[PDB]
Amino acid sequence: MGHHHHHHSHMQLASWSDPTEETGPVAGILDTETLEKVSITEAMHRNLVDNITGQRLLEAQACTGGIIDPSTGERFPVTDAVNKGLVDKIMVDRINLAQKAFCGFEDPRTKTKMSAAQALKKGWLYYEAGQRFLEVQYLTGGLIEPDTPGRVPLDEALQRGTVDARTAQKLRDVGAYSKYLTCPKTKLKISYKDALDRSMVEEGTGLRLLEAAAQ
Template structure:
């Protein structure tokens, strides 16, 4: 029985050469396709394009087109079943619809509604999540519950109240609001004030007994805090609602207010550190928290301030542990708290003297 001769080296080289040529042709075709898509433009009035001429390439890779949709359209162009004229028409319609829907899909922000488009611009959701929302395959509720989104819309929780041993049964812990603890002499007035200011500056004052979040005005009206603290807490709340630039009338952030000397630096550092410890710096214009890199970009934070907060000195440790008498950062004090098993709110245990 004759054996087949092994393939000659020449045959192998020929196959390799054909493969190389095929890959080269495919590469040339991809480069030609990219050039065509970059040179072909269409006028787009929706979104951030403002009526300018935009290349099909830019539209395909814009925030309005998901990865899956982009691959589907490119696949059709590569298979020559979709002409560039038709691609231009489809992309124009797609972007127009995505812009309209993304501005109507609303989330609950700290003080006002936030559009899905804004969350995308802030790096809180990605293009695919926006596409899912626009197409209805994901609901606002589902996206809100995503951990990566929830921290920027709701925060991760502040120091809500205190736990103290019960007078009648010291083995049991009694829940108190921070204001109650101050009036009962369990917390010093200064300690209580900075904790309440941190609550106001991170979103809302908290009624830990009723598990409610309230604005400063609401909290004073219902007696959660006394009217003697009203002005100081309103000032801290501006870290959420925004400070007014006296020169331009614009709404500006806590950090920007510090830069313009509208707020004392030590006070501002304390509130800023509390925001970061509870989920991120608050953008008062858009009414939600921001990832650090976006805060840098919007001028709500800088490297110098980041360094101050990353390497805290006694000057920037603005919070007092009533048990150990240490000066701490908000994050350090928050880590000493215990979460309530029913509400998830954080309580600081304070032992009576």
């Protein structure tokens, strides 16, 4: 039991330490045995990753906007990625919050352009889901919101007035969140940061590939 449906997921009382340096977006999975850059589904189909681990990685890409094809930073909708991408249909509703978190529950009229963090503060989206979506964004740099050219640093978000101290410290405590990623044989129980240390970049625009040796 891994992530949400099964085991523990959102933040909790565990610990607050171990910064997260040398990070980046993970687009796909790389088998060290063959150095093959393959889709999340393909890695799950073979024996490189679990269903839950693949789900979270796809969710993580959705948290960074669209679902990402390893190649040159492609962006596809969660539903669209299922239709012609590398996402399981069963994950559409589950991940749907993540893509909406950027811009999906925004009314097609007033265009308030709300962040995930702002959605949490006013209860637009969902506390448990949004915080997990903020987790992935924080690990890479800051928090992602519409209107802006990209992502705003947590500290900059504080002065910007889009987040409060209570939220910011929760972003500062990534360790509160459940581990997601499973290694073949070495420890298995690792965080995004630990995988990112072993995550090898496809080339330059193919973003990070998650290193795996099957088992």
